[PDB]
């Protein structure tokens, strides 16, 4: 695989692990509250904290797939989980983007330090829950009965997020209104993201190929499910966030909220899992 | 803290992350059999593959402790598993800490790779079992009735690794003989463990200090373990290795040179974890 050689022949060149307080710390039309007639009700003050929240948890977000889900299957591709895979070359793609997923980790973890430091206050990630796509991969693998089942189901969350996390990162990454700190800091995780598509989507493909028919399909309603999760918005980070800053009557419009939301994506641009679906010929079956 | 503070500093500063054939691959000295009668009725092929194997198992050793007990250490800190830590210095440091050991299990995953290469041979990870370490660290976690005691039982294996490192690098950094590129490799290693044994120790005086009295004794239990684990040659590693190459009557042999050997420390240099438990002045009660 010419794809997988080059990209560890050139790793050490690409990888990127080598303010103004007018500005806002986040993007309005990604709060939920934003859609809802309360926020007419919110002060400047409190609109300018769920800014900096919003930010604060797409760091968490961001950080919580990388810890919980991303890694993790990296992991489990090394360790030789899945048919199909192996030999050093792909070990040594792998165990560099391990590497760069750590370090996009640090740079979210930085990226919420700032906003603490510099807006001074706390925004503390313990106040936010599991993030949505942190939940349903949760809830996903505590209904697996075998060892096997986990490892397909982290597999295809990952492979979600890996081909998904560009279009996720696109919505900061080229919004010239937002602090700067915080768009370079997507933008530069951005850049990485790219080569890992490749690298997951050519895993993805070839381990659909060695498997038998039972966990093919085992497998692609993961990806499935990961998909679902990982485009909604997370209304229920949102609440935790409105419930502690102590917006009057946040939960009746978190109600409201999620009736009329409940249906747009956040995540709109599906052309990585689209495509990979297209190019294995199994774009078939959806939802 | 200001030994924390300044490591977060000055990391972007001096983190890492930023062949002869006639030259052994790794210390006969740190081969078992290398002090037994056997090693005269080997061929000087297989001899050299020894050598080889020694160096592939010295960077399993290594990723191992990284990947199941270090980082793991890392995650449950920055996840407030541990009374006495917290705040935003420490999480960037340890964040920071998490990019490195991820760098070092690509720099040793390469090591091994590099070997591989260039001896024109598998020496697959696959025919190592778990390390010794590795093994103990988990025999002491299936042990653990509640959750606190195995975050309690990795902290101490973790800072046992942490803090002990540097002179299981030693082995081999400084070695002149070796190949230059497996030297360079483990004295590149080397330079960042010198910050995290810092951080290490420092965070585990504290979590001690916050530990009820049960809690602390049952941290300190671990800590013993992990470090007699830690500093022992890996018998059962070897005789994988042995077995694998087809040794004649290494079993018997085997027998003979734990009979032999059981009591040798091939980490000899303690004074890490006996200078830790100095400050702290609770050096009193240990084995
Ligand atoms: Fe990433
Ligand atoms: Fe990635
Ligand atoms: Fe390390
Ligand atoms: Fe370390």
């Known amino acids: 695989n010419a794809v997988i050689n080059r990209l560890v022949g050139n790793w050490h060149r690409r990888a990127a692990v080598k303010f103004d307080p007018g500005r806002p710390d986040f993007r309005e039309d990604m709060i939920p509250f934003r859609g809802h007639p309360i926020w007419e009700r919110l002060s400047d003050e409190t609109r300018s904290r769920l800014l900096s929240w919003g930010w604060v948890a797409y760091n968490r977000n961001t950080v919580l797939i990388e810890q919980r889900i991303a890694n993790p299957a990296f992991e489990l591709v090394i360790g030789g989980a899945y048919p199909g895979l192996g030999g050093q070359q792909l070990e040594l793609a792998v165990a560099q983007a391990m590497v760069d997923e750590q370090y996009h980790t640090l740079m979210h973890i930085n990226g919420s330090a700032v906003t603490r430091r510099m807006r001074r206050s706390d925004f503390s ?116 966030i409105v419930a502690f800053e102590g917006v009057p009557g946040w939960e009746k419009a978190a109600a409201e909220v999620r009736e009329a939301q409940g249906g747009t994506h956040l995540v709109q641009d599906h052309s990585g899992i689209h495509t990979l679906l297209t190019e294995m010929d199994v774009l078939d079956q959806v939802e």
């Open 125 to 240: 990630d313990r106040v936010l829950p599991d993030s949505h796509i942190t939940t349903i991969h949760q809830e996903h693998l505590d209904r697996c009965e075998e060892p096997w089942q986990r490892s397909l189901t982290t597999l295809g969350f990952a492979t979600v997020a890996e081909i998904s996390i560009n279009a996720y990162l696109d919505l900061l990454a080229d919004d010239q209104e937002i602090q700067v700190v915080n768009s370079t800091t997507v933008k530069l995780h951005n850049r990485d993201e790219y080569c890992h598509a490749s690298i997951s989507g050519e895993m993805m493909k070839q381990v659909y190929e060695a498997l038998p028919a039972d966990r093919r399909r085992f497998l692609l309603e993961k990806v499935v499910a990961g998909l679902e999760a990982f485009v909604a918005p997370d209304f229920t980070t949102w609440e935790s």
